Design a protein around this ligand. Structure first.
Ligand SMILES: [Zn+2]
Ligand SMILES: [Zn+2]
Lengths: 76, 91, 135, 95, 118, 191
RNA sequence: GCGUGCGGUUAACAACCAACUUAGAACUGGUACGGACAGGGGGAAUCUGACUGUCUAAUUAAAACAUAGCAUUGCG
RNA sequence: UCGUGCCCCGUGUGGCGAAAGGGAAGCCGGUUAAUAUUCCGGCACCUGGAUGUGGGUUUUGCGCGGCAACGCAACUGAACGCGGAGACGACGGCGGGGGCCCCGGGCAGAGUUCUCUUUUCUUCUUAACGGUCUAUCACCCUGGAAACAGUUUGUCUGGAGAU
């Protein structure tokens, strides 16, 4: 797993061809939001403060990329 | 503060092996555990590595020497008469 | 008598250019604020010209006679002075202390050093300077 | 004789003791004499001879070790090589 | 809380290839983790000192890292240390100079012998 | 034990001039009281170097240049034919015949004394450590000096364990049972 | 917040924090106080083998054997 | 191309022999009546191969920076050589790190409660793999030490350059 600290790098990673899926994790106790994109080798995580602009980053993400919110319980 | 009156380094052997044998082993142990002045770098750091092998801790030079002393009197006399013979041969 | 003067040939003993031959452009014995010790401004050879044989073609000779230079500020303790001297008119004040503060000035200085050194090498003189030291 | 001359130079003139300061004196060109002890490593001995050949400085090969050279300079430490910058009242340079 | 552990492999002997360390899992359980032997620093071929700037790895792990990480940007870098390289440079220069001096002296002696013979 | 302690094979360089080697290591040899010296020589016929293993004479050191051949100097560690040395020179690892790479005076503190030369038939009279006199061909080589490690047997072993450690790496029979302590079926001294 | 040029060694002072040993004293119960457990009897001598070590698995563990030390013989 | 040849090199010789020696690479969670570092989920790694994209280098053709120790994502390298790693005893005390043990506070649960006990006990965890900032030895630069200094529990180190 790798942490991406730059929005431009994260957008390029999400525009890569092997980007199979992406998910959004919300941690309200720490007031943070994580964008995780699954590629062939690595899972890339961008960590942001929970904010409206962080919500609008989803619209700048590519539309063909499937994006899902993480539920509160990981059911098997 | 002298702790023993005569046995010295031979006190580790206690009352065993005989007084004369402890006295005989003492001289070799003292010479083989002493530190010697290096003839290359001048520091007092030459110690025995194995039997006949003397190494300097500072300049890392290793020298072939005597079994329990760095130099042997027969070897020193050999060097002297060798230098005499070399002078006679060259001149 | 002092020997660390201009046109003195020295060997670099430490750093990325250790073993290379340099010619002293400017001696600074008293030191500066940035380098508070005796040092020198030198120009030298990073890549020596290759050997030339009698059956080589002219294009191959021209390709193998190229020289890659470098310029350097170097401490006196990292130099080994040699009795050789290399007097070049084109290298007079090719570098100064302010040359090393700007990347483009280093480029222009290295181009000038390359031109002058290749001229001297093609002349056939000072062959010891252009042969590499083997160690 | 060299020991008495060294003692007189220590008393009156100016010296530097040691390899790095001797090299600095040879680079400055104000070195008048270089003394090199017998047990100095041959590479350092050749380097000191080359520096003295460049600076036109005389070299005396001291027959004692670095211990003996330090004692002759009047110190309680060893000295492999030393440089005389001012002879003082001695005549060590005239030889 | 159960604090005692077991080997996770079929070797039950405390050999040099059977090194373990204790971890606590995200499941809250104490467990062993089999670990490899420590890497060894490369050493200078002249003096034997540990070469600074070079990682200490098991031998085949060096095939997985890039060239600048395995070496020092200097002649003999990653094989000989800086002091030994400086000694090599000074020794080579001085010995070649002495060879030229001896050749000059030999030529002068040969010329003197030829003049004496003639 | 890695390599046997032998001279170089007798070649053109040692027969007609000298060759220089450098002493790189002085090492302990298990089962042998004398230290060994690893000396690196050049091969005259190829680029690769040759490593040799000599018995180290006293005074040899790492970084020392030694010289082997007919014209080598009379200095400790140098290997010369006996015809090139004066009378009274002590040597070690003396060849019985030229090219056998050394046979005589090999243990610690021991040496062979060159007593005389007979140049007419090319022979050399030598004295061995046992006091015996011998005649060898004058082209037999020997290393100038005395084998290092002398005085080893002056120290008492003092302990059965030290004797055991000495003989376990040597393969010699230890402990030793007396014949008279045996039954008559085992030893003629038995009973 | 760093740079100097100074000036002073009563910080011998304050604030906060922390653990286990050692010594001394009063009081007090007593048939017992290393309260169970754990844990040398000591001494005078003689013979004997120097010592540590080893053997007769399944009747003998020893003054037997070995040992270091000493002596002799053979071998270039 | 006298087309049906010529040149270079030297070291020998094959195999078996270790589920405790050497050795490329996997962790966590869950799952069965019975297997699990093997299944399932998530997250990785090694070895080998092919061939692209980005980035790098180059018109001073094979990078640049630092006095230096050396650094940085790259940054040509056949034959023939040199070196390192693999690769190494036993014992003693000292220092660092993980885990365990121990103490205090807090939320939740449980037990005790004639009296006492703000009480006694239990859960409070974080893997491989990576990024980043640091960690004894050692090494480099300045400078030149007797009124010798630094310094370990253990007396070693320094004009061969200490503090
Ligand atoms: Zn030394
Ligand atoms: Zn080195």
């Amino acid at each position: 797993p790798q942490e991406v600290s730059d929005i431009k790098k994260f957008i390029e990673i999400c525009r890569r061809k092997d980007a199979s899926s992406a998910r959004i994790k919300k941690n309200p106790k720490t007031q943070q939001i994580k964008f995780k994109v699954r590629c062939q080798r690595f899972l890339y995580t961008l960590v942001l403060k929970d904010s409206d602009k962080a919500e609008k980053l989803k619209q700048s993400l590519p539309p063909n990329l499937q994006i899902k919110d993480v539920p509160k319980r990981n059911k098997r | 503060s002298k702790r023993t009156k005569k046995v010295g380094i031979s006190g580790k052997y206690g009352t065993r092996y005989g007084a004369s044998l402890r006295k005989l082993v003492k001289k070799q142990e003292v010479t083989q555990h002493a530190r010697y002045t290096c003839t290359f770098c001048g520091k007092n750091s030459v110690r025995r590595t194995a039997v006949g092998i003397w190494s300097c801790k500072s300049c890392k030079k290793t020298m072939a020497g005597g079994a329990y002393t760095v130099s042997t009197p027969a070897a020193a006399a050999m060097r002297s008469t060798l230098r005499r013979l070399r002078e006679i041969t060259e001149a | 008598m002092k020997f660390l003067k201009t046109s003195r040939v020295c060997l670099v003993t430490r750093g990325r250019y250790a073993g290379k031959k340099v010619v002293i452009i400017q001696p600074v014995d008293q030191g500066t604020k940035s380098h508070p010790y005796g040092h020198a401004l030198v120009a030298g050879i990073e890549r020596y010209p290759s050997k030339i044989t009698r059956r080589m073609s002219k294009a191959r000779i021209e390709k193998r006679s190229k020289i890659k230079p470098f310029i350097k500020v170097i401490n006196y303790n990292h130099l080994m002075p040699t009795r050789y001297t290399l007097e070049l008119e084109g290298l007079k004040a090719v570098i100064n202390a302010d040359t090393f503060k700007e990347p483009s000035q280093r480029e222009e200085a290295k181009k000038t050093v390359k031109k002058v050194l290749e001229d001297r090498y093609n002349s056939g003189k000072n062959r010891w300077f252009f042969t590499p030291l083997r160690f | 004789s060299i020991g008495a001359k060294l003692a007189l130079v220590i008393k009156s003139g100016k010296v530097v003791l040691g390899y790095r300061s001797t090299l600095k004196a040879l680079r400055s060109g104000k070195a008048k004499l270089i003394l090199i002890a017998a047990n100095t490593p041959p590479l350092r001995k050749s380097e000191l001879e080359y520096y003295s050949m460049m600076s036109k400085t005389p070299v005396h090969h001291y027959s004692g070790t670095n211990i003996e050279l330090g004692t002759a300079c009047g110190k309680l430490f060893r000295c492999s090589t030393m440089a005389i910058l001012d002879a003082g009242d001695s005549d060590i340079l005239a030889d | 809380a159960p604090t005692r552990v077991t080997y996770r492999r079929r070797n039950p002997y405390n050999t040099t290839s059977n090194r373990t360390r204790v971890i606590k899992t995200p499941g809250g359980q104490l467990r062993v983790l089999h670990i490899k032997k420590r890497g060894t620093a490369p050493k200078c071929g002249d003096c034997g000192i540990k070469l600074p700037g070079i990682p200490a790895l098991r031998p085949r792990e060096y095939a997985t890292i890039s060239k600048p990480k395995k070496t020092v940007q200097r002649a003999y870098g990653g094989s000989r240390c800086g002091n030994c390289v400086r000694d090599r440079i000074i020794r080579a220069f001085l010995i070649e100079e002495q060879k030229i001096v001896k050749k000059v002296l030999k030529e002068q002696s040969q010329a003197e012998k030829k003049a004496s013979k003639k | 034990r890695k390599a046997p302690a032998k001279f170089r094979p007798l070649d053109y360089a040692e027969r007609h001039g000298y060759i220089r080697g450098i002493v790189k290591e002085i090492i302990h040899d298990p089962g042998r009281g004398a230290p060994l010296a690893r000396v690196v020589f050049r091969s005259p016929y190829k680029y690769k170097q040759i490593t040799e293993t000599f018995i180290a004479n006293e005074g040899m050191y790492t970084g020392q240049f030694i010289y082997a051949g007919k014209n080598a100097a009379l200095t400790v560690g140098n290997i010369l034919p006996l015809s090139s040395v004066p009378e009274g020179t002590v040597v070690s690892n003396v060849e019985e015949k030229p090219g056998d790479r050394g046979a005589l005076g090999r243990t610690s503190g021991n040496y062979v004394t060159v007593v005389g030369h007979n140049p007419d038939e090319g022979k050399t009279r030598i004295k061995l450590p046992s006091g015996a006199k011998k005649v060898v061909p004058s082209s037999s080589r020997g290393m100038i000096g005395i084998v290092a490690g002398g005085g080893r047997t002056d120290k008492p072993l003092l302990k059965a364990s030290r004797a055991k450690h000495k003989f376990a790496v040597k393969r010699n029979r230890w402990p030793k049972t007396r014949g008279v302590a045996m039954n008559p079926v085992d030893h003629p001294h038995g009973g």
